[PDB]
C-alpha cells in the first residue's frame, strides 16, 4: 500500500491561474503564516519558573547513586561484586574484606561519576537492593577530585534520605 505525493498539474482554468497570480503578486500566504504565528503569540507560553518550579518526573528516575541499609540495621551491601561484574564502564570498584564479626563485607566501594553512563544495570543486578539510583540530579561540581565517590560518601548520601528512596521503591517494587 502506497500513498504518494506531487501528482497534479497547475489548473489551466482562468480562476485557478489568476489565484496563483494573485498569490504571486499580492503576498498572501506569507501573511497567512504571519497570522498563524500571531495566533501562537496570543497564547500563553508554557514555561516553568526553574528555581521554584521543578519539572515533572517519574518514580523510576536514575540519579544520585545512593545506598540503603536495613531497618535499624547494618549496611545492606554484601560485596557480592555483581554490580562491578555488570558495570558497562567498570566504574564500580569493590575490594572486600570481612570484619571481626564474621559476616562478609567490604573495604572499598567506589563509583566513578565520570564513567557512570547511568544504565540501571547495577540496580537490576543487586540481589538485596543495596545500591539504588537516587532521586535527585544536582552534582554541578566545581572540582574533578570531588566527582569520585567513596563508600562513606555513599553512606552519608544514603543517610541524608531513605524516605524518598523507600517511597519510590514501595510504590514500584511490583513492576521490576
Amino acid at each position: 500500500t502506497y500513498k504518494y505525493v506531487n501528482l497534479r498539474e497547475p489548473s489551466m482554468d482562468m480562476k485557478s491561474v489568476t489565484d496563483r497570480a494573485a498569490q504571486t503578486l499580492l503576498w498572501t500566504e506569507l501573511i497567512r503564516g504571519l497570522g498563524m504565528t500571531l495566533s501562537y503569540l496570543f497564547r500563553e507560553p508554557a514555561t516553568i519558573n526553574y528555581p521554584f518550579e521543578k519539572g515533572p518526573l517519574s518514580p523510576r528516575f536514575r540519579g544520585e547513586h545512593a545506598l540503603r541499609r536495613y531497618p535499624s540495621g547494618e549496611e545492606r551491601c554484601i560485596a557480592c561484586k555483581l554490580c562491578e561484574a555488570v558495570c558497562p564502564a567498570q566504574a564500580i570498584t569493590i575490594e572486600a574484606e570481612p570484619r571481626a564479626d564474621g559476616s562478609r563485607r567490604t573495604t572499598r566501594y567506589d563509583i566513578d561519576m565520570t564513567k557512570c553512563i547511568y544504565c540501571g544495570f547495577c540496580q537490576e543486578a543487586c540481589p538485596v537492593d543495596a545500591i539504588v539510583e537516587g532521586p535527585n540530579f544536582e552534582f554541578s561540581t566545581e572540582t574533578h577530585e570531588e566527582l569520585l565517590y567513596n563508600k562513606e560518601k555513599l553512606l552519608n548520601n544514603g543517610d541524608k534520605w531513605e524516605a524518598e528512596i523507600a517511597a519510590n521503591i514501595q510504590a514500584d517494587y511490583l513492576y521490576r
Binding site: 570498584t93 575490594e95 572499598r108 567506589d110 577530585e145 569520585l148
Partner: protein, 126 residues
C-alpha cells in the same frame, strides 16, 4: 595471475605499527589453559591461548587502583593448533615460549576392584 612468487619468510612486524620496545622486549607464551581445578570440565581445553607476560602494576595514588603502562597486558589469542600458533608468532615478530599439551592420563578402575577380597583396594566406608 601466476606472478613472481618466491618461497620465503614473513616480516609483518615492520607493518603492524607496534613499537620496537614492545617488539623485542616483551615475550609471548603459547599454552593450552589448564582446567580450573575446582570444577572438573575440560571444555576450557581444546584451545591454544597466546598471552603476554605480566609487568608492573603500581598503586593509583588517589583511589587505590592498579594502573599500568602496558597496552598489551590484556591480550589473549585463542587458537586451535600449535603449528598455526608458532607460525603466527614468528610471522608477527616477537619471541615465544611453547608449553606442551597434557591430556588426563587414562586409568583402570572398577567397582568390583573397589570390592576386593584379598587385594588392598578396598573402599572401607560404604
Amino acid at each position: 595471475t601466476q606472478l613472481i612468487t618466491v618461497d620465503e619468510k614473513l616480516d609483518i612486524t615492520t607493518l603492524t605499527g607496534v613499537p620496537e620496545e614492545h617488539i623485542k622486549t616483551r615475550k609471548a607464551r603459547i599454552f593450552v589453559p589448564a582446567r580450573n581445578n575446582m570444577q572438573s570440565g575440560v571444555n576450557n581445553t581444546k584451545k591454544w591461548k597466546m598471552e603476554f607476560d605480566t609487568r608492573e602494576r603500581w598503586e593509583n595514588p588517589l583511589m587505590g587502583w592498579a594502573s599500568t603502562a602496558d597496552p598489551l597486558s590484556n591480550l589473549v589469542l585463542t587458537f586451535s593448533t600449535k603449528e598455526d600458533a608458532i607460525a603466527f608468532a614468528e610471522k608477527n615478530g616477537w619471541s615465544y615460549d611453547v608449553e606442551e599439551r597434557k591430556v588426563p592420563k587414562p586409568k583402570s578402575k572398577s567397582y568390583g576392584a573397589n570390592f576386593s577380597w584379598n587385594k588392598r583396594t578396598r573402599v572401607s566406608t560404604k
